[PDB]
């Protein structure tokens, strides 16, 4: 109390504007709040999670409501290839008449934004057909969010607040969140697909008013109990099936066709249903592994303690990891963030190659937006995982409880890890940049025949192993006389091979020297970002320059100019530096994906194969060439629908540049300037009446680095989003 | 429907932020509790 931030007496007593700024940046760091205990920490985290779930569900309900109320979902489902999905109306009083006329598209009769989220395709695939269904879903989600908000309030009452032992009941949590949250949820989703999505795709309207009397399969659970499950695979949808209608429709609900639906160029709904049924079964079985007051099950502490190889190469093995993980929220938060980042990358990599949604992969802008979105989120999640691991080392690691432990041995040979990571990064960077510059130079001198074009033999070999009969390797599924192909020949090999060998797909795009060089650049980026983050995490507890770094916390500005200078020595500074590399590598990945897909869509993939071997090709044939429809969003001759994207492009450039202001110029100059500003204000008549209550000071060093990084990131993301959306939507590629 | 945006967008973009910033300014520098 006594001022704005209650959770910090030190900040509360601060007389400057700093009190405000830090008051915002320390709010969610519950550990540091004054008079904070473990139990209250856990309960506050629980309530905050309830609130976050409510926010997510309200966001989803808003999307559904806006599409239902202002979208053209019915028109789109009628003709989903030619019309453009609508996001929401544009009521902007700042628009001029030509702008209103220009942004009127799709259904028209009002200014409107064309949705690039792909939610239309997803909702159409899952069986929704009318605005009424979207509205009902949104109302249900609003009610669910209200329920979650009430639950969050309720679990803060003294008689309903769960005890501390309840939170640390790892076994029961794992059991329920595996069998229940993952498995039963997947079982329910496959039930939906069988009961709603598939019948809706076959022209039959199933809804809440009739889903209890129309069984999804004519036999109706008789084969299931009798054991004749094959019945559910018989009579699949023939290739001449018009999605959403009974023309060429089948009756199977669980098949393993593989490949893609010819009309929608997406996965078969029955394949998804069978997939999710199998996943639900596996997760439900997995959730019965740990004991919860029922005698049977595993005790995880014993498991961790028992895995110490007798060879002694791991020292004490995993002894003491159970206590560190259960007692430290930062370690488990980092683990969860890392796994989520890997999964986000996996979704980005798999949705584009294996299209799950009907009529997607023809809405190019949506695919590009989704891929870029999920890759950037994956990068953010990975950086966060490593940052929270550094935090764990700073304030949660107990070297006495991890003596000779695997985790302790990680710090024991940290020098080797960091040095070999540095060697790999230097090797990759040196040589990849050298090859790129060599190609640039030879092509510049009109001698393209001298380029070092390296064929990605290993990636092409992998593609052949899956059935890519284009490189002539004759290995595994690419050779008929192989155990793999014959064993799989009956179930899914025909459809999968038909899909992979067809060049009208994203399944295993053909690759060449350009793909090789870009993949090595990506490896460089990943290795360098990992080097930065791992160095920060391992040196978080101290270095030769600061052997007592752990005593100064996770985020401190420096240790003064003494003994050589110690700018950016804290682990938080390692995260701040690694954020730039994360952005750079994700940008490389997204540039590679977008350019390859743009060239494929245009119908001249040779352009990429030719111009991706030297950097001038990237600068000319990708950035310079594809930005023409973007920068022409508004010219003195007029404007078109892309004007907003061009404006956002320039805006992102401006924010990116503004970030340099905080990243280059540091505090002392600005503090000395604010001194003169204060003097000037205090010595002005008619303005001496108005006096600040908080003394105005320059931003702190760490705050300034954070703000510069935030501007850098916001500008980066906005400009690249504008480019990727506008180019694709302007050239339809 | 077709009338709400006119009513709400000004409230959400002008009135709501104005009142919110007024209250936050009052609370930040309240000097008590």
């Amino acid at each position: 109390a006594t001022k704005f931030p209650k959770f910090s007496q030190a900040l509360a007593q601060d007389p400057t504007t700093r009190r405000i700024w830090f008051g915002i940046a320390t709010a969610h760091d519950f550990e540091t709040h004054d008079g904070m205990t473990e139990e209250k920490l856990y309960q506050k985290i629980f309530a905050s999670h309830f609130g976050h779930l409510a926010i997510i569900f309200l966001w989803t309900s808003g999307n559904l409501f806006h599409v239902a109320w202002q979208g053209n979902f019915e028109q789109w489902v009628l003709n989903p290839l030619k019309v453009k999905p609508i996001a929401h109306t544009i009521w902007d009083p700042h628009f001029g008449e030509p702008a209103i006329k220009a942004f009127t598209k799709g259904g028209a009769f009002y200014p409107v934004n064309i949705a690039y989220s792909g939610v239309y395709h997803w909702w159409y695939t899952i069986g929704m057909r009318t605005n009424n269904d979207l509205y009902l879903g949104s109302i249900g989600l609003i009610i669910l969010s209200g329920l979650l908000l009430f639950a969050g309030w309720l679990h803060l009452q003294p008689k309903f607040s769960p005890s501390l032992s309840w939170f640390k009941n790892n076994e029961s949590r794992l059991n329920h969140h595996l069998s229940g949250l993952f498995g039963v949820s997947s079982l329910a989703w496959t039930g939906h697909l069988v009961h709603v999505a598939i019948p809706e795709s076959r022209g039959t309207h199933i809804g809440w008013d009739n889903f209890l009397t129309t069984p999804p399969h004519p036999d109706g659970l008789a084969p299931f109990f009798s054991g004749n499950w094959n019945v559910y695979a018989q009579n699949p949808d023939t290739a001449q099936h018009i999605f959403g209608t009974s023309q060429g429709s089948g009756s199977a609900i669980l098949t393993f066709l593989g490949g893609f639906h010819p009309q929608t160029q997406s996965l078969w709904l029955t394949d998804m249903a069978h997939h999710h049924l199998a996943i639900a079964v596996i997760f439900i079985i997995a959730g019965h592994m740990y004991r919860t007051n029922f005698g049977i099950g595993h005790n995880m502490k014993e498991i961790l303690d028992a895995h110490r190889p007798p060879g002694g190469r791991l020292g004490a093995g995993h002894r003491g990891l159970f206590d560190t993980i259960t007692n430290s929220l930062h370690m488990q938060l980092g683990l969860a963030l890392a796994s989520l980042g890997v999964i986000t990358s996996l979704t980005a990599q798999h949705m584009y190659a294996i299209s799950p949604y009907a009529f997607m992969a023809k809405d190019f802008t949506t695919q590009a937006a989704l891929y870029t979105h999920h890759q950037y989120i994956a990068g953010f999640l990975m950086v966060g995982a490593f940052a929270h691991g550094a935090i764990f080392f700073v304030r949660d690691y107990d070297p006495e409880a991890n003596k000779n432990n695997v985790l302790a041995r990680m710090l024991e040979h940290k020098e080797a890890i960091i040095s070999h990571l540095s060697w790999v990064s230097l090797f990759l960077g040196f040589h990849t940049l050298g090859l790129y510059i060599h190609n640039d130079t030879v092509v510049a001198f009109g001698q393209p025949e001298k380029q070092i074009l390296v064929e990605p033999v290993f990636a092409q070999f992998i593609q052949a192993a899956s059935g890519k009969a284009l490189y002539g390797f004759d290995t595994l599924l690419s050779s008929s006389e192989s155990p793999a192909t014959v064993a799989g020949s009956a179930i899914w090999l025909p459809g999968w091979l038909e899909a992979i060998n067809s060049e009208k797909n994203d399944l295993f795009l053909t690759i060449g020297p350009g793909d090789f060089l870009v993949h090595h650049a990506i490896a460089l980026g990943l290795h360098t970002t990992t080097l930065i983050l791992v160095k920060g995490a391992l040196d978080a507890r101290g270095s030769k320059l600061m052997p007592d770094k752990k005593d100064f916390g996770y985020s401190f500005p420096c240790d003064g100019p003494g003994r050589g200078g110690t700018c950016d020595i804290s682990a938080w500074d390692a995260f701040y530096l690694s954020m730039f590399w994360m952005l750079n590598t994700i940008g490389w990945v997204t540039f590679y994906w977008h350019w390859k897909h743009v060239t494929i869509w245009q119908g001249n993939p040779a352009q990429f194969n030719e111009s991706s071997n030297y950097l001038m090709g990237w600068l000319r044939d990708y950035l310079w060439l594809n930005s023409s429809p973007l920068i022409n969003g508004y010219n003195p001759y007029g404007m078109n629908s892309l004007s907003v994207w061009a404006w956002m492009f320039l805006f992102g450039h401006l924010v990116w540049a503004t970030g340099f202001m905080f990243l280059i110029s540091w505090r002392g100059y600005w503090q000395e300037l604010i001194e003169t500003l204060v003097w000037a204000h205090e010595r002005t008549p008619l303005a001496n009446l108005i006096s600040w209550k908080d003394k105005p000071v320059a931003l702190s060093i760490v705050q300034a680095r954070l703000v510069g990084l935030a501007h850098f990131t916001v500008g980066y993301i906005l400009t690249y989003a504008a480019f990727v959306i506008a180019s694709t939507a302007g050239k339809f590629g | 429907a077709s009338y709400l945006p006119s009513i709400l967008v000004p409230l959400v973009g002008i009135v709501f932020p104005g009142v919110a910033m007024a209250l936050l300014f009052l609370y930040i520098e309240k000097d008590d509790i």
Binding site: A47, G51, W69, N132, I143, S145, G146, F150, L156 | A1
Partner: peptide
């Protein structure tokens, strides 16, 4: 094709949820 009644009841349920959010936040107790 959502009628004005549908929009109005959506707004009412949103208002109820907003009040619940107000109360939950208040209970997080700064």
């Amino acid at each position: 094709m959502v009628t004005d009644t549908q929009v109005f009841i959506a707004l009412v349920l949103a208002l109820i949820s907003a009040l619940l959010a107000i109360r939950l936040g208040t209970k997080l107790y700064v």
